[PDB]
Amino acid sequence: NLPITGSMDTAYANSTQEETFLTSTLCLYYPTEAATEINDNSWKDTLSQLFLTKGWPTGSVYFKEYTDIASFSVDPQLYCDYNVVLMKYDATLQLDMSELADLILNEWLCNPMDITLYYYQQTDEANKWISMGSSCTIKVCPLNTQTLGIGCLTTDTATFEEVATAEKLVITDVVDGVNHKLDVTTATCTIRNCKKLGPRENVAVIQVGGSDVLDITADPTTAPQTERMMRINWKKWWQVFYTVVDYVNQIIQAMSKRSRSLNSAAFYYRI
Amino acid sequence: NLPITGSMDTAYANSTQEETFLTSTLCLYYPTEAATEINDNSWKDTLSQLFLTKGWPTGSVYFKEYTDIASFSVDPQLYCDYNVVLMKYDATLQLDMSELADLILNEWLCNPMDITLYYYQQTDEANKWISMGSSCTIKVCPLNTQTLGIGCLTTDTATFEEVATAEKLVITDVVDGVNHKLDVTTATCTIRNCKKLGPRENVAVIQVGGSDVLDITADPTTAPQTERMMRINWKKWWQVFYTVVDYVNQIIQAMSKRSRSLNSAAFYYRI
Amino acid sequence: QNYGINLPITGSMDTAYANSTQEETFLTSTLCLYYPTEAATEINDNSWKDTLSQLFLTKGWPTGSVYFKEYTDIASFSVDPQLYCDYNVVLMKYDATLQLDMSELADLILNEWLCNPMDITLYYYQQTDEANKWISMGSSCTIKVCPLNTQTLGIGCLTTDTATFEEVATAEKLVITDVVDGVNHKLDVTTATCTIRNCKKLGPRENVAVIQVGGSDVLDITADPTTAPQTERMMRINWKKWWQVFYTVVDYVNQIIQAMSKRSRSLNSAAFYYRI
Amino acid sequence: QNYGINLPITGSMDTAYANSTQEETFLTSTLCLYYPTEAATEINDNSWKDTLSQLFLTKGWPTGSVYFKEYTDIASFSVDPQLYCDYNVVLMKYDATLQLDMSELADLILNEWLCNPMDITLYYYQQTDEANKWISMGSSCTIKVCPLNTQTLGIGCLTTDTATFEEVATAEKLVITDVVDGVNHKLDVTTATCTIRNCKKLGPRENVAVIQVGGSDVLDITADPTTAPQTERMMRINWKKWWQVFYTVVDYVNQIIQAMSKRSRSLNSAAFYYRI
Ligand SMILES: *[C@@H]1O[C@H](CO)[C@@H](O)[C@H](O)[C@H]1NC(C)=O
Ligand SMILES: *[C@@H]1O[C@H](CO)[C@@H](O)[C@H](O)[C@H]1NC(C)=O
Ligand SMILES: *[C@@H]1O[C@H](CO)[C@@H](O)[C@H](O)[C@H]1NC(C)=O
Ligand SMILES: *[C@@H]1O[C@H](CO)[C@@H](O)[C@H](O)[C@H]1NC(C)=O
Ligand SMILES: [Ca+2]
Ligand SMILES: [Ca+2]
Ligand SMILES: [Ca+2]
Ligand SMILES: [Ca+2]
Ligand SMILES: [Ca+2]
Ligand SMILES: [Ca+2]
Ligand SMILES: [Ca+2]
Ligand SMILES: [Ca+2]
Ligand SMILES: [Ca+2]
Ligand SMILES: [Ca+2]
Ligand SMILES: [Ca+2]
Ligand SMILES: [Ca+2]
Ligand SMILES: [Ca+2]
Ligand SMILES: [Ca+2]
Ligand SMILES: [Ca+2]
Ligand SMILES: [Ca+2]
């Protein structure tokens, strides 16, 4: 990172939309019920040809399927340069979907949390505990300077306070500056101490149906809808995919290249 | 592609090896027999830890396994920024080793061929026909200027001249300027008309045991033996992997980034 | 010398060349020929060494300067090879199945080494630099290594269970183990059957020339995968009979020793310098 | 850096004296004690080596720097001794019946020897100068010699008949033969149980000291009758208990090392002269 000096009289360059469409890849994540309703084995080819009409080279649009929001929330691996997640809306899962967005619309720096030997705390409002697995049931016992527990006994987990049960993904936020003993099913869950660095610009979430319920910020005073959080009413999935294809330029305009240099181990679908 | 003007007094920068390892990744391709002899369920983990001692961050080194040279030759996909292929030497598979090395050490620009409709010819010395699949059998019938076979009958394919039998990968080089009718088992193998653009500088091949027998150029008058074609003597595979880990600095020094802009969206690892 | 080793030597680029010292070199030097037992078997003669001495005399050597050290095979000769003469010419026989052993022997005798004892039963060992290796030789040498970590715990192997260690050498007369540098390794070796030393490669030998009889260029005297230097002291010939090989060696001894340099023979005959 | 050349070194007669290097020498060097088995039996303590190491530590030697090597007796030790430490001290018990054997042992280890092979079958051998000797080692060395004349016929001997050869060694573990220089000799040696080498005495071996435990001064490391030099590395002590001997060795180790110098042939400056 170096200072960048620019002249306000500089001329705008031509549109780079065609070049980025040519040199980038698009990943679409949709629920399995979409494929079920569409009921066509060649719909991937059809959408690829339509995207080609929109400018994307054949083979650069990758279609990925997930069973549901809860299943997809277990270590979501976003591959392409541009990722669009068609997330079905369920009034009962408002938190979970929000968490999923909170997981994929932001960059997270995470380190392992070996709870069974160590005591942990959250240093600042950017710190959270992200737990992912088949079943994440997390109980918390706040502690104090004398190392005793408040309304909890370290020797009896039954007295721990319940913050998660049977979760595929959950973001736990506790009071900062306080040590907590943790009890999570390590067999079916992995908990990580994470810091949200900032927005993840290459991931857009399109909520299919419902209303604006997403809250990607733990602060109760903010519920910001960024340009990467779209929301479309629906009755047929074919119309949903047609509107995704037709307004692909608008969707990618709302997104930007990831720009982060990572330390992780994930594959990517790039050109 | 613009001219670059440089001064012969510009100060050398510091070593980029540390940041290169922290920002790049290493795919190591080994045969199945290597894992069989190692006889450990966690040799990947210890090799990754040793690589970390050598500088690479955890999860950056990828370990891919192939049954043998023939099977690996069937459309090999190279994922990491730096690819090292440990190829065992067999005195009876020199041409197959050479063809694999040619395919993965050079950059190729390929287009499909329709052998059942049109006749084909090779324009210049860089033009070849690469056929790969489960079983490639290619027979050729050179035609004269009256589109009539020479020493072959266009109607009868039994008179055709056999250039490949049951191969999994074969690079066919015929006389340039002559139209050839091709009889290829398209049901089990695909043939593509390709041009050699240049070297793939991100792929190194380490020949385990044997002699210098590789020939990555069809010209009889050249056997280059470039700096990306190493050879070692061995008795045990653990020694081979320890040598690869210890001298990974030299291996990566012998390689450079791919530098080619691709029109194809494939699966890669990139940190 | 020592007190003037770090002193410059200045030469003028017009100093007249001295005459040939080849004749005076042969009259004050000793030549050692190392050949396999099968060479003597195929020759099938008892006075052949005397005839070779007389032929070398025809080539300018005094009687008493050429010596012939027979060795059974490469593997046995690889156990503490001893270099006796001013000039050593080792006739190695090529076998496709013993490429690594040939390379290890050439590495041992074509280079200077500085070795120290390794009491592998008490301490763990590292390899500090790319010039550091572990050279082990004996009747039979099986080496098992367990890399440790910063906490001194084995990686991929239990520090207490040798069965989990990693095999890098099985029943070796000679083996040069190269491990990842900077990592502590617990070792277990058949100490009864072989000795293992921590060795450092100082540089070439310059008085040992290895002639490979038959085969292709397969020797690799450097552990670095991206280098296979073919120095002027590692020669290769094609053969159908051993008398022709010996006649070639005698007739081109001028060329063979022009490719070697005197002053490199150590007081000891060992292929390595040793410090305890 | 300039290894093959002897460059003069100039020094001013008034520069300074650097500080004592004894402490650093003891910290970065290794000491080896060679003693007879009967010493160990008389001491009759299992942990005595540990006690001696502790006592040396009191004198500034880091633990593990001092080594103790056992040898059965003078004759057995004389068979190809291998002194590998930086500093070597050999406690040699005096036997009035083994005066020449002790002299030969000391001459072998207190001097520097450059040895070439000898093939008694092929060649007849001369000794060129006063520094040329024939050193033979083995389980049993029996050397008989027939001096020839200018016509290659024996003098007081027949080359074909070894029974007439003049015996100069019988069942020796080590023997240094000195014969008349400039005379070709035919040698009969028990090659099965003995190897003979044509050796040149280059000079003193600085880093080897011999402490004679017992009788008067009898060692003669010089083949010349007119001189029997007693160098500062040839110590002599009167004894009644081996514990007393070892305590004397430990207490005066400063003086013992002061009487010795780093082996000139074993440090980098010796590179491309003979060894390292
Ligand atoms: C930009 O668009 C204009 C308008 O057609 C065209 O003339 C020009 O070549 C394009 N490229 C650049 C680099 O300005
Ligand atoms: C480069 O290395 C030098 C010396 O190793 C050091 O002073 C300097 O800070 C390093 N970084 C840069 C950017 O020059
Ligand atoms: C060197 O060779 C030349 C010509 O063969 C001869 O005249 C001369 O005496 C020789 N010796 C020396 C010391 O130059
Ligand atoms: C040498 O000895 C003197 C006097 O004891 C001391 O002051 C000095 O630090 C020592 N070291 C050097 C390098 O002179
Ligand atoms: Ca949840
Ligand atoms: Ca409670
Ligand atoms: Ca908090
Ligand atoms: Ca909020
Ligand atoms: Ca093939
Ligand atoms: Ca035909
Ligand atoms: Ca062609
Ligand atoms: Ca070629
Ligand atoms: Ca070997
Ligand atoms: Ca293991
Ligand atoms: Ca190493
Ligand atoms: Ca090499
Ligand atoms: Ca007689
Ligand atoms: Ca004797
Ligand atoms: Ca004499
Ligand atoms: Ca004397």
Question: How would you characterize the overall build of this protein?
Answer:
Chains C, D: Disulfide bonds join 32-85, 115-199, 141-194, 146-157. Chains C, D: Glycans are attached at residue 19. The structure is cut from a larger assembly and holds 4 copies of chain A. Chain A is an alpha/beta fold and 271 residues long. In chain A, 21% of the residues lie in helices and 29% in strands. The first copy, chain A, is built from 7 helices and 13 strands. The first copy, chain A, has helices at 17-23, 32-38, 43-54, 69-72, 94-104, 237-246, 248-253, and strands spanning 26-31, 61-66, 82-88, 106-112, 127-136, 138-142, 161-162, 167-172, 180-184, 190-199, 203-208, 229-232, 267-270. Chains in contact: A-B, B-C, C-D. Chains C and D meet through helix 3, strand 2 and strand 11 of C and strand 4 of D.
Order of helices and strands of chain A: HEHHEHEHEEEEEEEEEHHE
Helical run tally of chain A? 7
Shape of chain A: globular
| Most extensive chain interface and residues per partner | C-D, 35 and 37 residues
Radius of gyration of chain A: 21 Å
Oligomer: part of a larger assembly
Spatial arrangement of strands, main beta sheet of chain A: 2-1-3-11-12
The percentage of residues in β strands of chain A lies in 25-35%
Largest sheet of chain A: 5 strands, parallel
Bound molecules: 2-acetamido-2-deoxy-beta-D-glucopyranose, calcium ion
Number of strands of chain A: 13
Helix fraction of chain A by DSSP (H/I, runs of at least 4):
10-25%
Region (GPR motif) (chains C, D): 203-205
Glycosylation sites (chains C, D): 19
Organism (chains C, D): Rotavirus A (strain RVA/Monkey/United States/RRV/1975/G3P5B[3])
Keywords (chains C, D): Calcium, Capsid protein, Disulfide bond, Glycoprotein, Host endoplasmic reticulum, Host-virus interaction, Metal-binding, Outer capsid protein, Signal, T=13 icosahedral capsid protein, Virion
